Coordinates of N, CA and C in Angstrom, one line a residue:
Chain A
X1 N -227.3 -104.0 189.3 CA -228.0 -103.9 190.5 C -228.2 -102.7 190.7
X2 N -227.0 -101.8 191.6 CA -227.2 -100.6 191.8 C -227.3 -100.9 193.6
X3 N -226.0 -100.8 193.8 CA -225.4 -101.2 195.7 C -224.5 -100.5 195.4
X4 N -223.9 -100.8 197.1 CA -222.4 -100.0 197.1 C -221.5 -100.4 196.6
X5 N -220.9 -99.3 195.4 CA -219.1 -99.6 195.1 C -218.5 -99.1 195.8
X6 N -217.2 -99.4 195.8 CA -216.1 -98.4 196.5 C -215.7 -97.7 195.0
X7 N -215.8 -96.7 194.9 CA -215.2 -95.9 193.3 C -213.6 -95.6 193.4
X8 N -212.8 -96.7 193.9 CA -211.6 -96.6 194.5 C -210.5 -96.7 192.9
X9 N -210.7 -98.0 192.6 CA -209.8 -98.6 191.5 C -210.3 -98.1 190.3
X10 N -209.7 -96.1 189.9 CA -210.2 -96.0 188.7 C -209.5 -95.1 187.8
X11 N -208.3 -96.0 187.1 CA -207.5 -95.7 186.0 C -208.2 -96.4 185.3
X12 N -208.9 -96.6 184.6 CA -209.2 -97.0 183.0 C -208.1 -96.3 182.2
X13 N -207.3 -96.5 181.9 CA -206.1 -95.9 180.5 C -206.6 -94.7 179.9
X14 N -207.7 -94.9 179.1 CA -208.4 -94.1 178.1 C -210.3 -94.2 178.1
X15 N -210.5 -93.0 179.5 CA -211.9 -93.4 179.2 C -212.5 -91.9 179.1
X16 N -212.4 -91.5 177.7 CA -212.8 -90.6 177.0 C -214.2 -90.6 176.7
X17 N -215.5 -90.7 177.5 CA -216.5 -91.0 177.2 C -217.5 -90.6 178.1
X18 N -218.7 -90.7 177.6 CA -219.9 -90.2 178.6 C -219.8 -91.2 179.9
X19 N -218.8 -91.4 180.7 CA -218.8 -92.5 181.5 C -218.1 -91.7 182.6
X20 N -217.1 -92.6 183.1 CA -216.3 -92.0 184.3 C -216.8 -91.4 185.8
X21 N -218.1 -92.1 186.3 CA -219.0 -90.8 187.0 C -218.4 -90.4 188.2
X22 N -219.2 -89.6 188.7 CA -218.6 -88.8 190.1 C -217.6 -87.9 189.3
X23 N -216.7 -87.0 190.1 CA -215.9 -86.0 189.5 C -215.4 -86.4 188.2
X24 N -215.7 -85.1 187.5 CA -214.9 -85.3 186.1 C -214.7 -83.6 185.5
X25 N -215.1 -82.9 186.0 CA -214.7 -81.1 185.7 C -214.4 -81.5 183.9
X26 N -215.3 -82.1 183.4 CA -215.6 -81.7 182.4 C -216.9 -80.7 181.8
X27 N -216.8 -80.4 180.8 CA -217.7 -78.9 180.7 C -219.2 -79.7 180.5
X28 N -220.2 -78.8 180.9 CA -221.4 -79.1 181.2 C -221.9 -79.0 179.9
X29 N -222.2 -77.7 179.4 CA -222.7 -77.4 178.1 C -221.9 -77.3 177.3
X30 N -222.3 -77.5 175.7 CA -221.0 -77.7 175.0 C -221.3 -76.8 173.9
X31 N -221.0 -76.6 172.6 CA -221.0 -75.8 171.2 C -222.6 -76.3 170.3
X32 N -223.1 -75.6 169.9 CA -224.3 -75.6 169.0 C -224.8 -74.8 168.4
Chain B
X1 N -199.3 -105.5 224.8 CA -199.3 -104.5 224.7 C -198.8 -103.7 223.5
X2 N -197.2 -103.5 223.4 CA -196.6 -102.7 222.8 C -196.7 -103.4 221.2
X3 N -196.7 -104.5 221.0 CA -197.6 -105.4 220.1 C -198.8 -104.4 219.2
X4 N -199.9 -104.5 219.8 CA -200.8 -104.1 219.4 C -200.8 -102.4 218.9
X5 N -200.1 -101.7 219.7 CA -199.8 -100.3 219.7 C -199.2 -100.1 218.2
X6 N -197.7 -101.3 217.9 CA -197.5 -100.9 216.4 C -198.5 -101.3 215.4
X7 N -199.3 -102.3 215.9 CA -200.2 -102.9 214.8 C -201.4 -101.5 214.2
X8 N -201.3 -100.7 215.3 CA -202.9 -99.7 215.0 C -201.8 -98.8 214.3
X9 N -200.2 -98.5 214.4 CA -199.6 -97.4 213.6 C -199.4 -97.5 212.3
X10 N -199.0 -99.2 212.0 CA -199.0 -99.2 210.9 C -200.5 -99.3 209.6
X11 N -202.0 -99.3 210.6 CA -202.8 -99.5 210.1 C -203.3 -97.6 209.5
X12 N -202.8 -96.8 210.4 CA -203.1 -95.5 210.3 C -202.4 -95.0 209.1
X13 N -200.8 -95.7 208.9 CA -199.9 -95.3 207.7 C -200.6 -95.8 206.1
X14 N -201.4 -97.1 206.5 CA -201.8 -97.4 205.0 C -203.3 -96.5 205.1
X15 N -203.8 -96.0 205.7 CA -204.9 -94.8 205.3 C -204.6 -93.9 204.8
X16 N -203.5 -92.8 205.4 CA -203.0 -91.7 204.9 C -202.5 -92.1 203.3
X17 N -201.3 -93.2 203.0 CA -200.9 -93.4 201.6 C -202.1 -93.8 200.5
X18 N -203.7 -94.7 200.9 CA -204.5 -94.6 199.9 C -205.1 -93.2 199.8
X19 N -205.2 -92.6 200.9 CA -205.9 -91.3 200.8 C -205.1 -90.1 199.7
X20 N -203.9 -90.6 199.6 CA -203.0 -89.8 198.0 C -203.5 -90.6 197.4
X21 N -203.3 -91.9 197.2 CA -203.7 -92.6 196.0 C -205.0 -92.1 195.5
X22 N -206.3 -92.0 195.9 CA -207.2 -91.4 195.5 C -207.6 -90.0 195.0
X23 N -206.8 -89.3 195.6 CA -207.0 -87.9 195.3 C -206.3 -88.0 193.8
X24 N -204.9 -88.3 193.8 CA -204.1 -88.4 192.3 C -205.1 -89.3 191.2
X25 N -205.7 -90.3 191.8 CA -206.5 -90.8 190.5 C -207.5 -89.7 189.9
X26 N -208.7 -89.0 190.9 CA -209.4 -87.8 190.4 C -208.8 -87.3 189.6
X27 N -207.5 -86.7 190.1 CA -206.6 -85.4 189.2 C -206.4 -86.3 187.8
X28 N -206.0 -87.5 187.8 CA -205.4 -87.9 186.5 C -206.9 -88.2 185.6
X29 N -207.5 -88.5 185.9 CA -208.8 -88.8 185.2 C -209.3 -87.4 184.6
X30 N -208.8 -86.7 185.6 CA -209.7 -85.0 185.0 C -208.5 -84.8 183.7
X31 N -207.3 -85.1 183.7 CA -206.1 -84.2 182.9 C -206.6 -85.4 181.7
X32 N -206.8 -86.4 181.5 CA -207.7 -87.0 180.3 C -208.5 -86.4 179.9
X33 N -209.6 -86.0 180.4 CA -210.8 -84.7 180.1 C -210.2 -84.0 179.4
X34 N -209.3 -83.4 179.9 CA -209.0 -82.0 179.3 C -208.1 -82.3 178.0
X35 N -207.4 -83.4 177.9 CA -206.5 -83.7 176.8 C -207.8 -84.4 175.9
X36 N -208.3 -84.5 175.9 CA -209.4 -85.0 174.8 C -210.3 -83.6 174.2
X37 N -210.4 -82.7 175.3 CA -211.0 -81.2 174.9 C -210.3 -80.6 174.1
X38 N -208.8 -80.7 174.7 CA -208.1 -79.5 173.7 C -207.5 -80.2 172.1
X39 N -207.7 -82.0 172.0 CA -207.7 -82.1 170.8 C -208.9 -81.9 169.6
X40 N -209.9 -81.7 170.4 CA -211.1 -81.3 169.6 C -211.1 -79.9 169.5
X41 N -211.0 -78.7 170.3 CA -210.1 -77.7 169.9 C -209.3 -77.7 168.5
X42 N -208.0 -78.2 168.7 CA -207.1 -78.2 167.9 C -207.8 -78.6 166.1
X43 N -208.4 -79.4 166.5 CA -209.4 -79.7 164.6 C -209.9 -78.9 164.2
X44 N -210.7 -78.3 165.3 CA -211.7 -77.1 164.6 C -211.0 -76.1 164.3
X45 N -210.1 -75.2 164.7 CA -209.2 -74.4 164.4 C -208.3 -74.8 162.8
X46 N -207.8 -76.4 163.0 CA -207.5 -76.4 161.4 C -208.3 -76.6 160.6
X47 N -209.7 -77.1 160.6 CA -210.8 -77.1 159.4 C -210.9 -75.6 159.2
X48 N -211.1 -74.9 160.2 CA -211.2 -73.1 159.9 C -210.1 -73.0 159.0
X49 N -209.1 -73.1 159.3 CA -207.7 -72.6 158.8 C -208.2 -73.1 157.0
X50 N -208.6 -74.5 156.9 CA -208.3 -75.0 155.6 C -209.5 -74.6 154.8
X51 N -210.6 -74.1 155.4 CA -211.9 -73.3 154.8 C -211.3 -71.6 154.2
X52 N -210.1 -71.4 154.7 CA -209.6 -70.3 154.8 C -209.0 -70.1 153.0
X53 N -209.6 -70.7 152.1 CA -208.8 -71.3 151.0 C -209.4 -69.9 150.0
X54 N -210.7 -70.4 149.6 CA -211.5 -70.4 148.0 C -211.5 -69.0 147.9

């Protein structure tokens, strides 16, 4: 839908994906 | 009176605890990301090592 979600219970054991929104501190630009 | 006072105190306690909970949540997910990155770096260095033979 797109509506208010509480981004609280947020430990998926391994979300090493283009996912896990909001704060990540991943790197923005990569090798190329 | 005193009943309701104690009620409000329990409320503020649960609040601060869950504050800690959320902060640690974000920290741990960030650690997950970093461990993935270092994994990739390890492999890349290893392929260059293997290409150092011919």
